[PDB]
Amino acid sequence: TQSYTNSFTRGVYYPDKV
Amino acid sequence: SKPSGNYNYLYRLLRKSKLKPFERDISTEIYQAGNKPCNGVAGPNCYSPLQSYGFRPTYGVGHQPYRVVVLSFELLHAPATVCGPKKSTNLVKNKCVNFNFNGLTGTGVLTESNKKFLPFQQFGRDIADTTDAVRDPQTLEILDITPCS
Amino acid sequence: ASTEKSNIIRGWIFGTTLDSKTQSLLIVNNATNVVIKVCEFQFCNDPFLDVYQWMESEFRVYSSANNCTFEYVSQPEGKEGNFNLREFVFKNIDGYFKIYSKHTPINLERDLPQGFSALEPLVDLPIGINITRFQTLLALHRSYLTPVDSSSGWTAAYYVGYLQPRTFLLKYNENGTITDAVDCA
């Protein structure tokens, strides 16, 4: 049901609108 | 305010934890102050946290009801809709002129570069945080702000 | 994050205790519109969306809704088409609920591929909710209708990651896109 993985280089977003 | 007492306002005298900015806690649960589990009824260890006001005109200035209006606006450079009664002129090109798109004043030259701005992006800043590129609010073209001679 | 292509995950819920005693955020994404409401929803032990299959969906995730002080319908919100990985970043700070989204095609095995994919801002609205728990809403689609009873026919694949305050060094490309990042901590 539940598994454990690792995100290598994902999870980034633009902080501001510049 | 009423001379007999206006009881249509509460202020949540008691709370378990401090509230964070810009939050709303309208929970009417009984504040359990003691150790015994409060069963939703008033007791010696848990009372009503929501207390009513006693607004009456007989009280002096300072205890009377005061309406507070907090205007929280965002002045960050971003695509906006509210831009006062500021009117618009035409669009000149390749000349040292002033620019006031959304309150950003200054002096520069428009060059109509090929920078690809995203729909949520309207202003662009350089290393020194000086706005060198802007998106026209009316036309969807991109214009750079280069200093004059 | 999830890589399904059958419109299973189409909404989420947010709240502190997930009952009618406190406020709760209900966000549901339909095939043509999106509904976002802040009300005292009485979430059951197993909230899920019902379908009478094609249309006429029933909101069996809550039992009652009275206060309903905030509603929002954008209908541009999160589907990003049906043809794979749709990443989402939910943020609740200073009473504002920020949502990010990004659509990245998958051309690898059933695992998180390498590279970088920056998420774009989607919406920012105030809810003023002390969000401490959440749950993913998914359409069962058991070929028939199902009552409000929990533990339905699950017989007939999403990633969850927690965010932390981290300092990053973003690298912008010549075209303005983020192609690399460094987690200093």
Short mmCIF file of C-alpha atoms in Angstrom, two decimals:
data_model
loop_
_atom_site.label_atom_id
_atom_site.label_comp_id
_atom_site.label_asym_id
_atom_site.label_seq_id
_atom_site.Cartn_x
_atom_site.Cartn_y
_atom_site.Cartn_z
CA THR A 1 0.00 0.00 0.00
CA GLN A 2 2.74 2.44 1.03
CA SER A 3 6.23 2.64 -0.45
CA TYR A 4 9.25 4.86 0.17
CA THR A 5 11.12 6.58 -2.66
CA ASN A 6 13.45 9.57 -2.98
CA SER A 7 13.14 12.67 -5.16
CA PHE A 8 16.49 13.39 -6.77
CA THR A 9 16.11 16.91 -8.21
CA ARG A 10 12.39 17.71 -8.19
CA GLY A 11 10.24 20.01 -6.09
CA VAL A 12 11.38 23.46 -7.30
CA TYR A 13 9.05 26.35 -8.15
CA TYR A 14 9.31 30.03 -9.04
CA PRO A 15 9.35 31.99 -5.75
CA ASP A 16 8.43 35.40 -7.22
CA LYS A 17 6.87 36.69 -10.44
CA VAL A 18 10.01 38.44 -11.73
CA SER B 1 -24.49 50.20 20.43
CA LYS B 2 -27.77 49.95 22.33
CA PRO B 3 -28.81 51.45 25.69
CA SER B 4 -30.04 48.03 26.86
CA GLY B 5 -26.89 46.24 25.70
CA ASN B 6 -25.87 44.97 22.26
CA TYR B 7 -24.86 41.30 22.55
CA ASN B 8 -24.16 40.65 18.85
CA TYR B 9 -20.34 40.75 19.11
CA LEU B 10 -17.86 38.25 20.56
CA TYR B 11 -14.10 38.46 21.05
CA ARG B 12 -12.97 34.93 22.10
CA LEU B 13 -11.57 35.89 25.49
CA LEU B 14 -9.81 32.54 25.93
CA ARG B 15 -7.94 30.33 23.48
CA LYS B 16 -5.59 27.37 23.80
CA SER B 17 -2.82 28.73 21.54
CA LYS B 18 -1.86 32.08 20.05
CA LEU B 19 -3.41 32.77 16.66
CA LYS B 20 -1.29 33.25 13.55
CA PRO B 21 -1.58 36.36 11.35
CA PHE B 22 -4.54 36.44 8.95
CA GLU B 23 -6.42 33.48 10.43
CA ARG B 24 -10.01 32.92 11.57
CA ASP B 25 -11.07 30.73 14.51
CA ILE B 26 -14.86 30.56 14.74
CA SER B 27 -14.86 27.37 16.81
CA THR B 28 -17.48 27.52 19.57
CA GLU B 29 -16.10 24.59 21.57
CA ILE B 30 -15.80 24.85 25.35
CA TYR B 31 -12.29 25.89 26.36
CA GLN B 32 -11.01 23.04 28.55
CA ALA B 33 -8.80 24.80 31.09
CA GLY B 34 -8.59 21.97 33.63
CA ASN B 35 -7.44 18.37 33.44
CA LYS B 36 -10.83 16.64 33.40
CA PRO B 37 -12.15 16.09 29.84
CA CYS B 38 -14.84 18.72 29.34
CA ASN B 39 -18.02 17.14 27.94
CA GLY B 40 -19.24 20.24 26.09
CA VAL B 41 -20.96 21.78 29.14
CA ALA B 42 -19.91 24.66 31.37
CA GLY B 43 -18.06 23.59 34.50
CA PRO B 44 -15.53 24.70 37.11
CA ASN B 45 -12.64 23.76 34.78
CA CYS B 46 -14.08 24.77 31.38
CA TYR B 47 -16.13 27.86 30.52
CA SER B 48 -17.37 29.54 27.36
CA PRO B 49 -14.41 31.20 25.58
CA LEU B 50 -16.72 33.43 23.52
CA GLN B 51 -17.64 36.43 25.68
CA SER B 52 -20.15 39.08 24.59
CA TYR B 53 -19.65 42.84 24.60
CA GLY B 54 -21.57 45.28 26.77
CA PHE B 55 -21.76 48.09 24.22
CA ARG B 56 -23.87 50.90 25.69
CA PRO B 57 -23.85 54.60 24.71
CA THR B 58 -23.54 55.53 28.40
CA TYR B 59 -19.88 54.47 28.38
CA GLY B 60 -17.33 57.17 27.67
CA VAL B 61 -15.10 57.42 24.63
CA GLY B 62 -12.85 54.34 24.64
CA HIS B 63 -15.40 51.67 25.58
CA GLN B 64 -17.73 52.46 22.66
CA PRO B 65 -17.85 50.15 19.61
CA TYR B 66 -15.25 51.20 17.03
CA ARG B 67 -15.46 49.80 13.50
CA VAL B 68 -12.00 48.89 12.19
CA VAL B 69 -11.34 48.43 8.47
CA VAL B 70 -7.98 46.93 7.46
CA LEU B 71 -7.02 47.39 3.80
CA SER B 72 -4.40 44.74 2.99
CA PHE B 73 -3.06 45.32 -0.53
CA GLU B 74 -0.03 43.87 -2.33
CA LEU B 75 2.28 46.42 -3.96
CA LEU B 76 4.66 43.82 -5.40
CA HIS B 77 5.48 44.22 -9.08
CA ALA B 78 3.10 41.72 -10.70
CA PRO B 79 0.21 41.66 -13.22
CA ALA B 80 -2.50 43.72 -11.52
CA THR B 81 -6.01 44.87 -12.37
CA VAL B 82 -6.56 47.86 -10.08
CA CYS B 83 -4.65 50.77 -11.40
CA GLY B 84 -6.45 53.85 -10.17
CA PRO B 85 -7.76 56.67 -12.34
CA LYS B 86 -4.40 56.95 -14.10
CA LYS B 87 -5.07 57.54 -17.79
CA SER B 88 -3.10 56.26 -20.76
CA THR B 89 -1.06 57.85 -23.55
CA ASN B 90 0.28 56.34 -26.74
CA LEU B 91 3.32 54.16 -27.23
CA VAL B 92 6.41 55.85 -28.68
CA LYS B 93 9.47 53.81 -29.64
CA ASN B 94 13.24 54.38 -29.82
CA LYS B 95 13.41 57.64 -27.87
CA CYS B 96 14.27 58.85 -24.36
CA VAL B 97 10.86 59.26 -22.71
CA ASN B 98 9.26 58.71 -19.31
CA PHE B 99 7.28 55.58 -18.51
CA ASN B 100 4.52 54.93 -15.97
CA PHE B 101 2.91 51.54 -16.56
CA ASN B 102 1.63 50.54 -13.11
CA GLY B 103 3.17 53.21 -10.88
CA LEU B 104 6.77 52.41 -11.87
CA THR B 105 8.27 55.82 -12.66
CA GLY B 106 11.60 56.45 -14.32
CA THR B 107 13.36 57.38 -17.54
CA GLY B 108 14.51 55.06 -20.29
CA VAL B 109 14.17 53.93 -23.90
CA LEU B 110 11.80 51.22 -25.12
CA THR B 111 13.30 48.72 -27.55
CA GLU B 112 10.64 45.96 -27.89
CA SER B 113 13.00 43.05 -27.28
CA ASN B 114 12.29 39.33 -27.67
CA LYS B 115 12.15 38.37 -23.99
CA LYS B 116 9.63 35.59 -23.32
CA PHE B 117 7.56 36.58 -20.28
CA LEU B 118 5.17 34.13 -18.65
CA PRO B 119 1.49 35.03 -18.09
CA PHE B 120 2.12 35.59 -14.36
CA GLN B 121 5.23 37.71 -15.07
CA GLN B 122 5.09 41.41 -15.98
CA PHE B 123 8.26 43.02 -14.58
CA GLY B 124 11.88 41.97 -14.97
CA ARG B 125 14.83 43.14 -12.89
CA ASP B 126 18.58 43.05 -13.49
CA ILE B 127 21.41 42.15 -11.10
CA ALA B 128 20.95 45.47 -9.28
CA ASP B 129 17.17 44.86 -8.96
CA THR B 130 16.58 47.72 -11.42
CA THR B 131 13.58 47.01 -13.65
CA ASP B 132 15.02 46.70 -17.17
CA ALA B 133 12.10 44.88 -18.84
CA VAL B 134 8.34 45.32 -18.49
CA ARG B 135 5.21 43.84 -20.04
CA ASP B 136 2.74 46.39 -21.37
CA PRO B 137 -0.54 46.08 -19.43
CA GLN B 138 -2.66 46.73 -22.52
CA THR B 139 -0.67 45.13 -25.35
CA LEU B 140 0.81 41.66 -24.82
CA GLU B 141 4.19 42.72 -26.24
CA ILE B 142 7.39 42.91 -24.19
CA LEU B 143 9.33 46.17 -23.87
CA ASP B 144 12.80 46.62 -22.39
CA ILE B 145 13.78 49.63 -20.29
CA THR B 146 17.28 50.70 -21.32
CA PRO B 147 18.79 53.91 -19.91
CA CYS B 148 19.26 56.86 -22.23
CA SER B 149 22.54 58.33 -23.48
CA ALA C 1 2.76 14.09 -7.67
CA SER C 2 1.06 11.37 -9.70
CA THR C 3 1.25 9.86 -13.19
CA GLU C 4 -2.26 8.47 -13.70
CA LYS C 5 -4.18 9.10 -16.94
CA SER C 6 -7.72 8.05 -15.96
CA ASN C 7 -8.75 11.14 -13.92
CA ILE C 8 -8.73 9.21 -10.63
CA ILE C 9 -7.26 11.95 -8.41
CA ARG C 10 -9.37 15.06 -8.99
CA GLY C 11 -9.43 16.92 -5.68
CA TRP C 12 -8.17 17.27 -2.13
CA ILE C 13 -9.43 18.32 1.29
CA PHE C 14 -7.75 20.48 3.93
CA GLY C 15 -8.60 21.07 7.57
CA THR C 16 -7.57 20.68 11.19
CA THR C 17 -9.98 18.04 12.53
CA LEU C 18 -11.97 17.37 9.32
CA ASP C 19 -15.34 17.77 11.06
CA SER C 20 -18.19 20.27 11.30
CA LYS C 21 -16.73 21.75 14.51
CA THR C 22 -13.92 23.55 12.64
CA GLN C 23 -13.47 25.02 9.18
CA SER C 24 -12.33 22.84 6.30
CA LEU C 25 -11.15 23.50 2.74
CA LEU C 26 -12.85 21.52 -0.03
CA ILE C 27 -11.18 21.60 -3.46
CA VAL C 28 -12.65 19.41 -6.21
CA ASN C 29 -11.66 19.42 -9.89
CA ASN C 30 -14.30 18.37 -12.41
CA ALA C 31 -13.94 17.71 -16.14
CA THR C 32 -15.01 21.27 -17.03
CA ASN C 33 -14.80 23.39 -13.85
CA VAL C 34 -13.31 23.57 -10.36
CA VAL C 35 -15.11 24.21 -7.06
CA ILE C 36 -13.31 25.60 -4.01
CA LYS C 37 -15.40 26.18 -0.88
CA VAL C 38 -14.55 26.90 2.76
CA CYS C 39 -17.27 25.48 5.00
CA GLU C 40 -17.82 23.29 8.07
CA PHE C 41 -17.81 20.03 6.14
CA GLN C 42 -18.41 16.84 8.14
CA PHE C 43 -15.84 14.60 6.48
CA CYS C 44 -16.43 10.87 6.88
CA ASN C 45 -13.82 8.22 7.64
CA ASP C 46 -13.35 7.52 3.90
CA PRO C 47 -14.32 10.51 1.74
CA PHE C 48 -14.65 9.81 -1.98
CA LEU C 49 -16.45 11.19 -5.03
CA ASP C 50 -19.36 9.23 -6.50
CA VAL C 51 -20.36 8.89 -10.16
CA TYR C 52 -23.64 7.62 -11.64
CA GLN C 53 -22.13 6.14 -14.82
CA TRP C 54 -20.58 10.16 -17.23
CA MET C 55 -22.29 13.03 -15.41
CA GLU C 56 -24.30 13.90 -12.28
CA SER C 57 -21.53 13.57 -9.71
CA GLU C 58 -22.46 13.40 -6.03
CA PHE C 59 -20.40 14.96 -3.23
CA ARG C 60 -20.44 12.14 -0.68
CA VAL C 61 -17.27 13.40 1.03
CA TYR C 62 -19.12 15.54 3.61
CA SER C 63 -22.34 15.25 5.60
CA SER C 64 -23.29 18.89 6.25
CA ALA C 65 -22.20 22.41 5.28
CA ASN C 66 -23.75 25.43 7.01
CA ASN C 67 -21.40 28.41 7.45
CA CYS C 68 -19.81 28.36 3.97
CA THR C 69 -18.13 31.74 4.34
CA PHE C 70 -15.86 31.44 1.27
CA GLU C 71 -16.47 30.03 -2.21
CA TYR C 72 -14.34 30.18 -5.35
CA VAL C 73 -14.92 28.87 -8.89
CA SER C 74 -12.15 29.58 -11.41
CA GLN C 75 -12.81 27.02 -14.20
CA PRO C 76 -9.72 27.94 -16.31
CA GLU C 77 -7.65 23.63 -12.44
CA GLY C 78 -5.11 20.83 -12.10
CA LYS C 79 -6.18 18.39 -14.80
CA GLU C 80 -3.59 19.66 -17.33
CA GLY C 81 -5.09 17.52 -20.09
CA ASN C 82 -5.53 13.77 -20.37
CA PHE C 83 -2.57 12.93 -22.64
CA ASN C 84 1.82 12.54 -17.58
CA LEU C 85 3.31 13.62 -14.25
CA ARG C 86 1.42 16.59 -12.77
CA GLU C 87 3.32 17.98 -9.78
CA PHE C 88 1.62 20.20 -7.21
CA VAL C 89 2.99 22.35 -4.37
CA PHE C 90 0.47 23.48 -1.76
CA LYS C 91 1.49 26.31 0.57
CA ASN C 92 -0.46 27.93 3.42
CA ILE C 93 1.38 30.88 4.98
CA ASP C 94 -0.01 34.14 6.40
CA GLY C 95 -3.54 32.92 5.67
CA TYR C 96 -2.94 32.73 1.91
CA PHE C 97 -3.23 29.31 0.24
CA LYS C 98 -0.74 29.16 -2.64
CA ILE C 99 -1.01 26.45 -5.30
CA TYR C 100 1.63 25.51 -7.88
CA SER C 101 1.36 23.18 -10.85
CA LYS C 102 3.43 21.83 -13.74
CA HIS C 103 2.91 19.25 -16.50
CA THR C 104 5.96 17.18 -17.46
CA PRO C 105 5.75 14.30 -19.98
CA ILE C 106 7.08 10.98 -18.69
CA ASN C 107 9.29 8.86 -20.96
CA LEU C 108 10.85 6.52 -18.39
CA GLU C 109 9.95 3.66 -16.07
CA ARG C 110 7.69 3.79 -13.00
CA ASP C 111 10.05 6.00 -10.99
CA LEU C 112 10.92 9.66 -10.49
CA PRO C 113 13.10 10.64 -13.46
CA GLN C 114 16.15 12.88 -13.24
CA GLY C 115 16.38 16.50 -14.32
CA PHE C 116 14.58 19.64 -13.21
CA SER C 117 11.00 20.82 -13.73
CA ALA C 118 10.00 24.11 -12.11
CA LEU C 119 6.36 24.56 -11.12
CA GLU C 120 4.31 27.60 -12.14
CA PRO C 121 2.02 29.60 -9.83
CA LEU C 122 -1.64 28.69 -10.21
CA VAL C 123 -3.79 30.58 -7.68
CA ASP C 124 -3.42 32.48 -4.40
CA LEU C 125 -6.52 32.95 -2.25
CA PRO C 126 -6.99 33.55 1.49
CA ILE C 127 -8.84 30.92 3.54
CA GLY C 128 -7.51 31.61 7.04
CA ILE C 129 -7.50 27.94 8.02
CA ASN C 130 -5.16 26.25 10.50
CA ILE C 131 -4.48 23.39 8.11
CA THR C 132 -2.81 20.45 9.85
CA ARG C 133 -4.27 17.42 8.00
CA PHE C 134 -5.22 16.66 4.41
CA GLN C 135 -6.51 13.80 2.29
CA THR C 136 -6.64 13.08 -1.43
CA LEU C 137 -10.05 12.82 -3.10
CA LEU C 138 -10.36 10.18 -5.82
CA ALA C 139 -13.30 9.10 -7.97
CA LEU C 140 -14.12 5.44 -7.33
CA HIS C 141 -15.95 4.74 -10.62
CA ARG C 142 -17.22 1.29 -9.60
CA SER C 143 -19.46 1.19 -12.74
CA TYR C 144 -22.52 1.89 -10.53
CA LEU C 145 -23.72 4.18 -7.77
CA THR C 146 -22.55 3.76 -4.18
CA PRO C 147 -24.08 5.04 -0.91
CA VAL C 148 -22.46 7.45 1.55
CA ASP C 149 -21.12 4.47 3.53
CA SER C 150 -17.35 4.36 3.92
CA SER C 151 -15.06 1.48 2.89
CA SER C 152 -16.55 1.14 -0.59
CA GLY C 153 -15.48 -1.19 -3.39
CA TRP C 154 -11.83 -0.22 -3.75
CA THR C 155 -11.31 -3.34 -5.90
CA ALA C 156 -12.77 -1.68 -9.01
CA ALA C 157 -0.36 5.68 -7.51
CA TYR C 158 0.49 9.15 -6.17
CA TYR C 159 3.56 10.48 -4.37
CA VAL C 160 3.43 12.67 -1.26
CA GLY C 161 6.33 14.81 -0.07
CA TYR C 162 6.64 17.20 2.85
CA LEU C 163 8.16 20.66 2.40
CA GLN C 164 10.64 22.34 4.72
CA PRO C 165 12.18 25.83 4.86
CA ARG C 166 15.28 25.41 2.69
CA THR C 167 17.69 27.83 1.01
CA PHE C 168 18.09 27.18 -2.72
CA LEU C 169 20.34 28.61 -5.44
CA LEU C 170 18.27 28.88 -8.62
CA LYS C 171 19.97 28.96 -12.02
CA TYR C 172 18.02 30.64 -14.82
CA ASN C 173 18.68 29.74 -18.45
CA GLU C 174 19.09 32.21 -21.31
CA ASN C 175 15.37 31.84 -22.08
CA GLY C 176 14.46 32.52 -18.44
CA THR C 177 13.79 28.90 -17.45
CA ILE C 178 15.20 27.23 -14.34
CA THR C 179 17.49 24.39 -15.42
CA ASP C 180 19.38 23.66 -12.18
CA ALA C 181 19.12 24.14 -8.43
CA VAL C 182 21.21 23.53 -5.32
CA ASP C 183 19.89 22.69 -1.84
CA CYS C 184 22.40 24.43 0.42
CA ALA C 185 21.33 22.42 3.49
#
